[PDB]
Paper text:
Poxviruses are among the largest double-stranded DNA viruses, with members such as variola virus, monkeypox virus and the vaccination strain [name] (VACV). The core is one of the uniting factors in all the infectious poxvirus forms and fulfills one of the key roles in the virus lifecycle, that is the protected transfer of the viral genome and required accessory proteins to a newly infected cell. Room-temperature and cryo-electron microscopy (cryo-EM) analysis of VACV has revealed the presence of a regular, but discontinuous, palisade layer formed of spike-like assemblies on the outside of a continuous viral inner core wall. Here we show, using a multi-modal cryo-electron microscopy (cryo-EM) approach in combination with AlphaFold molecular modeling, that trimers formed by the cleavage product of VACV protein [name] are the key component of the palisade layer.
Our analysis revealed that hydrophobic interactions dominate within the 2,104-Å2 buried surface area per protomer pair. There are also several conserved inter-chain salt bridges tethering central alpha helices together within the trimer. Remarkably, each pair of protomers assembles a core heterodimeric three-stranded beta-sheet (residues 85–110), formed by two strands from one monomer and one strand from the neighboring monomer. A hydrogen bond network on the outward surface of the beta-sheet further reinforces this interaction, while the opposite side of the beta-sheet packs tightly with underlying hydrophobic side chains. When analyzing our [name] model, we found two highly conserved cysteine residues (C31 and C569) in close proximity to each other, which conceivably could clamp the N-terminal and C-terminal domains of [name] monomer together, stabilizing its conformation. The model of our trimer fits into our STA density map with high agreement, leaving no major area of density within the palisade layer unoccupied. This strongly suggests that the [name] trimer is the main constituent of the palisade layer. However, our fit into the STA map also revealed that the lateral interactions across trimers within the palisade layer are not extensive, given the wide spacing between them. Interestingly, the bottom of the [name] trimer facing the inner core wall is strongly positively charged.
Numbering used by the authors:
A (entry chain C), B (entry chain B), C (entry chain A): 1 to 599
The structure:
C-alpha cells in the first residue's frame, strides 16, 4: 500500500510529464487510418524562443522558420520606428531577449471577451504572444507572430483602427539582431556584429561610412559607443583616411548612407548639414523626403499597395539657406520622377522605403497556409468530422476570429461562443511536449504502427534484463506510469503499450540492463500501470530466501492481445500494435513469473 | 471511439466554458424554493474594468456602479496626493488603464497567511485587487475597491497603522478621468476633456483662469502642455484678454483657482507670488493654510470627524515680506473664524478640504450593504444553513476578516481557518461567466422554472431541424457538452436539461436549422452528454444507403421524466423543468430514431 | 441533496486547505515503521520571507536559518557589487523586500528544458527562487538561496561560465539590512540602524569616521542623506570636533575607513585626495590595490582558494603626483609582503578582502547536508525504496541536476527525464501547509500514533457537546471535509481519523461546545465525509417535534475498527490510531443516534 496513486494537484497538471498524457489520451482514440494534417505536424513557436534555444528547431519546419525569422525582423523594425502603434512587448539584445513586463493595458479597444487561460506549457515567448493575442486586436498578434500572407484568397480579412503595411520579404534580420556576438548599440533597430572581440570588418565599413554624416560635436559619442578607433586598428583600417563626405543631394553619388544615418543613428546622435545645390537644407522632413524619393524612385508606384492614401506628386519644394542665410524656395521636378510626402512620419517610412528596396533586390518569401495564424474558414471548421475536431480541440489550442466594433479579435473559441459571437475563422496552435510536437508524436506513432510487419508475442525465457529501452528511456517510461489510475485493464494496456511504442520510436539507444536488486521495483511499476495487482511474498527453500513478485492477472499473450482487440478499431490494428511493441513486451511477459533467489 | 472524453488538464479548468460548469454544478443542488440573496445577484467588478469594457455593466447594478465610480475617483485623488500610504497599483489614462507591475512588496506588515490563489477567471483589475486584498491590509482593499460605508452599525471595524479619512460623496470623477477624449496632462489627478480635437471650452475656461497663478518663466510649459493658445483660437477665446490676476488673500474674490493651482498644477510648474495685504507670502505652507481656511471655513468643524487629532485655532500667523524685504509677523483672527494647520501634508489635505466642499454642495452617496466589502457578521455566516453556505462557497470567492497585530486582514476564509485564527466578518465575491454573474444565471434559472406553466413532453414528428436554439445558442450548448463524463444518466440529464433552459432564458434569437449532412454530429454530442450510447450503422435498401444513428437507451418521455423525478426535490419540480425545456426536448425526442436516407 | 460535493476547479486546487490534502493523501500510505528523514522534517523557505513573516520560523531549524541569513547577506553584498553576473532578483529595504519584476530574460545560456510549473503554494520569495532555479544555471540558484557547502565530498560539482568565490562565514548581515528600524541609505549594500528616530550611535560613529574621506563639495549630500548633524546632536556628539583625517597610506593608522568609503559610499559621493608619502595618488585602482593589500596581507594566500588565477606579486607600483604635479613612479616592496592586482574589479573585490577579514575574525558557519540544495547523489535517489521515493515525489518538489554545454542546470526531475538527459543529483523541497511543513505534519502524526497507549472505543452517552476540538479546531476539521468524495468507507475513515489526529496534535486549546441549533450541521458534515449517508426526518410525539438525524451505516466501534484493520499495515496499528483519536471518536459515536427534541 505505497503512495503510487495520487490526488489531483496543480503541480501534477503542469509538469511536462503531464503533457505526454495528452499524447497518450488522444492517440488511443485515433484509428490507424486517421490522418494528421501536414500543416499541423509542426507548430508555432515564436522564433524569439527558437533562436535562443535552438533545440526547439525540432518542432518547426526549417523553411517556415526562416520565413518567420525574416518577417519578424522586418516587423520588429517597423514597430520599433513606429509611434502610432506599439505592438511588440519584447526588447531584443545580444544572445538574449527581454520580455517586457509592460503594465497590463486595458482600453476601450480590447477584446470584450475575458481571457482566463495562461498557456503555461509553452516557451516564455509563446506564452507571451498568446496572452497578447487573446487580449488585443488580432492584427497585432499576426504582426508580432511574424505572419506572412499565403498566396491565395483563403485568408482572413483583418480589421483594425490602425494598420501597418503588408510587406513580405526574405531576409535574416532577426537572426542578425540576436546574433550573440554583436554590439549592444544605442540603436534598437540594428546590432552590428563582433569578430575577434571588435567591430566586424563588414559592419565597420558601414559605420565609418555612416560617420561621414555625423557632426564633430558628437563624433566622440559615436566612436566611443562603437569603439571604432580600436576596431579600425585591429583590422588595419585607417579611420582618419576616410574620403571627404557627400552632403549635397544634387551630386551625392549614394544616398543610402544618409538614409541610414537618419533612420538609425540620428536617434541618439545629431546630424551634419546637408545641402541642395550648395544651399543648406532647412527642414529635416524635406531632406528625408527628397533623399528617399530620389533613391527609391522605382518604388514610389509600390507605396500605394500598402499606403493607398499617401500623397505623391511630380513637384517637390525644398527649403534651403543660401550663403547670406536667406530662405530659398527650391522647386524640383524632373521628367518621370515622382516625389513623396511622408507626412512627417519619418522613421517609420524611411524604414519602409528601404525595406521595399530590399524587396526589389532579394527574393520574395513564400509560405503555405499558416494553421496557427490564418487558420481555417469557420465553415470548414464546423464542417469537420467530430473525430478530427476533437483531436484539434485537445492537441491544439483552438482559437476563433470574430468581428466587433469594426475590429477583429482572436480568442479561445469556446469563449467566443460563450460570449455569444460568431467566428469567421479558426486557428490552431499545436502543443510542445519535451521538445517534440504533440501532433508529431501522435502522427509518427500512428504511421510507424500502421507501416509495421506482424508477428506473435515474445516468449518467456531467462535472464531478461532489458525492457528494450536505454537508461534514459527506462526512466521516461517508468516515471510517466506514476500518473496511472484504476480503470479497465483494457484501457490501461492500450495506453501503456502505445506509450511504449512512442518512446521506442524516438529512443535510438542501446538497451540498459536491470540489476537483481531493483528488478522488482520496475515490475511493480509497469504492471500496476496496466491495472494488474502486484504483491510481494517470501518463501523459504531450505536455508535460502525467495522474494516472490506475484502478479494477478498475469501478463502473457492472451491478456494483451485480447484486451487490445476489445479496444482496437480493428483486430488487425491490435496485431500491428503488439508487433511494434515486441521489444518491450518481451520483458513484460518474461518477468511475469519473476522470483529473486537469495543464495 | 472518438476523443470526446478527456483528461483533466489545466487549460480545460481555465477557459470560461468551465465556469459555466459551476452554474451547472450548483444549480442542480438547489430546490426551486431556494432563495438567492438580492445583494448577491450582482457582483463586484472593479469599475476600472467596467469603464473600459462596458459590456460588463450586465453584472453590476447601475446605481451601485455609479456609486463605486464616484468613490473610486475620490479615493484615487486621495491616494494620488498621499505620500504616507501608497494603496493604488493602477495608473489611469485616456480611455485606458495601466495595472502597474509593481515589485511584489513584502513587509513586516503583510498578511501572515500565504495567498496561494490567482483569481484567473476575473477581469484583469479584479484579479489585481483580489491579489492585493489577500496580501495586504483589508483597509487598503476597501479603499481601492471604492467602498462606501452602509448606513448602519452592521459593518466592519477596520484596523490599521495608518488611515485615510472616511469621505462618502456622489460625483463622476473616475468617469471624467478615464473619458477617452481627454488630454493626457502632466497631472495624474485630473484629465481635462477634449472637444473637436482641442481643449473643451468648459475645461479651457478653468485652465486659462488657473494660468493667472503661474509665473512667466513657466507659462510656455503650461501653454504647450495643454495647447491652450490653439484651443483658445478654435473656440473664439482671446487668451491674451484675461482679467488681471488676483494674487492677494485679503481682497482675492475667489480662492478656488489658487487652490487648484497648488493642488494639481504646482507639481510640474512653479507658482506666482501671493501677497497678504500687499506683503509677499513667505511660506508655501501658510498660503495653503490661510487660503483653505478662509475658503472652507464652514467645513472646519467637519475635519474632526475624519481627522480628530488635527490642530484648529482662532489665530493664524502668516509670514510675509514687505517692500524692504523685512520679515513680517502677521496675526490674523476674525470673530467666528477658525484656522487649520495641515502639518505640511499639503497636497493630501488640499484635496480633502475641496472634497468636503463638494460634499456640502452635491448629494450624499447612499448604498446598501456591500456583500463583497463589508460582508456578513461571522456569526451570521456560521449560523447559515448548509445549503446556503455551500452555494456561496462555490459560486463566490469566500473571504474572512480577522484581527492580528492590531490590524485587520482579509483572506480566503479557508486559509484563516487553516492558519488557526477566528474571523470577524465574511465577504463574498460572486464570479462572472461570459458577461453574466454566476449567481444571476443560477437565480434566473430557478425563478423562470418555478414561475412556468406545465404540460407533457413534445411528440415525435418529421423534419425537426431546430433544437430551439439560434446558431449562437447551438454552439454554446454543444461545445459545453464536451466537458461530459460517465456517471448516472439521472445526474447527466438534470444537468443537460437545466443548461438547456439556462441558455434559452438568455438566447432570444430565431431557431437555426440543422442540415442533413451534420445532423448526426449534433445527435452524437447531445445524447452522449446525457449518458446515452450512440452508434452508427449502415443499411442497404435496394440500391440506397441508410445511415442509422442508434441511441441506447432511447430518449422519449418516460426516460426524462422518470430520471428527473428521481433526482428532483419534488415530482412537481420535475414537471416544471420539462415544460421550461419543451422547445429543446422536441429535438431530443424526435431525432431519437433518426435515419439519414441516401437517395 | 445540498452542494457538498464538487467539480474540480482551479481555485479548489490552490487554497491551502487543499495542501492539507497532501498530508491526508500521503500519510495514509505510510506504515508506522516508516521513517521520515531528519533532514526533510524542516524545509527551505527563502530567508527573505522568514525575516518579514517570522511565523514561518516554524518550518525551518533555527541553526539552519541563522546560517542561511548569514550567507545570504554575504551573497547579496557580492552580487550587489558584482557586474559580470547579476544573480539576485530582489532589492532589500527597511522592513520590506521588493521582488523585482525583471524582464523575463531568455538567452543562449538558459536551461534547455521548458519550465512549466509555477510553485503557487510557496511564499512569494520561494516561488521566485524556484522559478529562477528552473530557468537559469543551478549555480545561480545556490547562490541566491544562501547555500553553504556541507563539510564533505557528498556534494555537487557545479558548472558554469562565470563563478563567484566559495566563501562560508557566520554573520548577521541579512538581518541587519532588513532590520525595520534602519535608514534607507543611497547605498544598497548596507543599511545603518535607527535608534530613537535617529542614526544609532554605533552606526553614527562609523559614519562620522567615514566622513573623513569625503570632499567638502559633497559633504552636504552625505550629511543630508543620513541626517548626521541631527543624530549627532541627539546623542551628544559634536560632529565638528572629529580628529584630523588620515589620508596618507604610509602613516594611516587604520585602513578600514577608506576601504568602506570606496566600497560603499563612493558610489553616490566623490572622494578626498589620498597620498602616498606626501605625493597624491593618481590612480583609483592603485589606492585600492595598495590599501587592501596592506590591510589584508594575511589573507592574500587565501585568495587563491577562490580566485586561483588572480595575480599576486611582491612589487607594487603606485603612481603619484608630487608638489610640482610631476608623475612619480613609486615602487613598494617589503620583506614578506604580498600585493594583489584586482584587475580593476574594484567593488567586487573590496567586498571580498573585507569578507575574508571577517572570516578570519569570527567563526565558520557549519551546516549539515542541505537536501534542498545539494541533495542526494542520483544513484542514491534511484536506489531508494519505492515507498520512500513516492513519499518525496508528492510531499516535496523533486528536482534533478544535470550537465549540458559544460554548465549544470536544475529542473523538475520529470522534465529532465522527458528531455532525455541523465541527472547527477536530486534535490528536495518540502511544501509548507498553514505554517507547518508537510513532512513534519506527516512525521509527527506517525510518531505520536506509534508512541501511543491503547484502549477501546468511547462509549455512547448524553450531552456530548465537544468534538475534542476548540472553536478554531472545529472549523479546520469541518471545512476540510468539504473536499470529500464517494469512495470506499474504508479509505474515507482512515483519512478522516488521521486528519482528526493531525489536528489534535497541534490544537492545544479547550473543547468548544456545540449548540442544539447547529448540532445537526456538524453531524451532516462529519459523517458525509466518511462515506455515511445522512438524512433528516421529522417525528410527532404528542404535540412535540423531533428532528431526527439518521445515519446509515451508523458509526459505532465495529465500523471504525473493522475498516481500519482492513486498510492498516497491521491490526495493531489500527488499534494505535483509534486510541490517538479517542477524544474525537467520542462525538462521532455518541451522536450516531442523535435526536433533537422541540419542547
Amino acid at each position: 500500500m505505497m503512495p503510487i496513486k495520487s490526488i489531483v494537484t496543480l503541480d501534477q497538471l503542469e509538469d511536462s510529464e503531464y503533457l505526454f498524457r495528452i499524447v497518450s489520451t488522444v492517440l488511443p482514440h485515433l484509428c490507424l487510418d486517421y490522418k494528421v494534417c501536414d500543416q499541423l505536424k509542426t507548430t508555432f513557436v515564436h522564433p524569439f524562443d527558437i533562436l535562443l534555444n535552438n533545440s526547439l528547431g525540432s518542432v518547426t519546419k526549417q523553411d517556415e522558420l526562416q520565413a518567420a525569422i525574416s518577417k519578424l525582423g522586418i516587423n520588429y523594425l517597423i514597430d520599433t520606428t513606429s509611434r502610432e502603434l506599439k505592438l511588440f512587448n519584447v526588447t531584443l539584445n545580444a544572445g538574449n531577449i527581454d520580455i517586457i513586463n509592460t503594465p497590463i493595458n486595458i482600453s476601450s479597444e480590447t477584446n470584450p471577451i475575458i481571457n482566463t487561460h495562461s498557456f503555461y506549457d509553452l516557451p516564455p515567448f509563446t506564452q507571451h504572444l498568446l496572452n497578447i493575442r487573446l487580449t488585443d486586436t488580432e492584427y497585432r498578434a499576426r504582426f508580432i507572430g511574424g505572419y506572412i500572407k499565403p498566396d491565395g484568397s483563403d485568408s482572413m480579412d483583418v480589421l483594425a483602427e490602425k494598420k501597418y503595411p503588408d510587406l513580405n520579404f526574405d531576409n535574416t534580420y532577426l537572426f542578425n539582431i540576436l546574433y550573440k556576438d554583436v554590439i549592444n548599440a544605442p540603436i534598437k533597430e540594428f546590432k552590428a556584429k563582433i569578430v575577434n572581440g571588435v567591430l566586424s570588418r563588414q559592419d565597420f565599413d558601414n559605420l565609418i561610412g555612416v560617420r561621414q554624416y555625423i557632426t564633430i560635436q558628437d563624433r566622440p559619442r559615436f566612436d566611443d559607443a562603437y569603439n571604432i578607433a580600436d576596431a579600425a586598428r585591429h583590422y588595419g583600417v585607417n579611420l582618419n583616411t576616410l574620403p571627404l563626405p557627400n552632403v549635397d543631394l544634387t551630386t551625392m553619388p549614394t544616398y543610402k548612407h544618409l538614409i541610414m544615418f537618419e533612420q538609425y543613428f540620428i536617434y541618439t546622435y545629431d546630424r551634419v548639414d546637408i545641402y541642395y545645390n550648395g544651399n543648406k537644407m532647412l527642414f529635416d522632413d524635406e531632406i528625408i523626403n527628397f533623399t528617399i524619393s530620389m533613391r527609391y524612385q522605382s518604388l514610389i508606384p509600390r507605396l500605394v499597395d500598402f499606403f493607398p492614401d499617401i500623397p505623391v506628386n511630380n513637384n517637390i519644394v525644398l527649403h534651403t539657406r543660401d550663403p547670406q542665410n536667406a530662405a530659398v524656395n527650391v522647386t524640383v521636378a524632373l521628367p518621370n520622377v515622382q516625389f513623396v510626402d511622408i507626412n512627417r512620419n519619418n522613421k517609420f517610412f524611411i524604414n519602409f522605403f528601404n525595406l521595399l528596396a530590399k524587396e526589389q533586390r532579394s527574393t520574395a518569401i513564400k509560405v503555405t497556409k499558416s494553421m496557427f495564424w490564418d487558420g481555417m474558414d469557420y465553415e470548414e471548421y464546423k464542417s469537420k468530422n467530430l473525430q478530427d475536431m476533437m483531436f484539434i480541440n485537445s492537441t491544439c489550442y483552438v482559437f476563433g476570429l470574430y468581428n466587433h466594433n469594426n475590429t477583429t479579435y482572436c480568442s479561445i473559441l469556446s469563449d467566443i461562443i460563450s460570449a455569444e459571437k460568431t467566428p469567421i475563422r479558426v486557428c490552431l496552435l499545436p502543443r510542445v511536449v519535451g521538445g517534440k510536437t504533440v501532433t508529431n508524436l501522435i502522427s509518427e506513432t500512428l504511421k510507424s504502427i500502421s507501416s509495421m510487419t506482424i508477428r506473435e508475442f515474445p516468449r518467456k525465457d531467462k535472464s531478461i534484463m532489458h525492457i528494450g529501452l536505454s537508461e534514459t528511456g527506462f526512466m521516461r517510461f517508468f516515471q510517466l506510469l506514476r500518473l496511472m489510475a484504476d480503470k479497465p485493464h483494457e484501457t490501461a494496456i492500450k495506453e501503456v503499450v502505445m506509450a511504449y511504442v512512442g518512446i521506442k520510436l524516438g529512443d535510438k539507444g542501446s538497451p540498459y540492463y536491470i540489476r537483481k536488486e531493483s528488478y522488482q521495483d520496475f515490475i511493480y511499476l509497469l504492471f500496476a500501470s496496466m491495472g494488474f495487482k502486484v504483491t510481494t511474498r517470501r518463501s523459504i527453500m531450505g536455508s535460502n530466501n525467495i522474494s516472490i513478485i506475484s502478479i494477478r492477472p498475469r501478463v502473457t499473450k492472451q491478456y494483451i492481445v485480447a484486451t487490445l482487440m476489445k479496444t482496437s478499431c480493428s483486430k488487425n490494428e491490435a496485431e500491428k500494435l503488439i508487433t511494434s511493441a515486441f521489444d518491450l513486451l518481451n520483458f513484460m511477459v518474461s518477468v511475469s513469473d519473476f522470483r529473486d533467489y537469495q543464495s
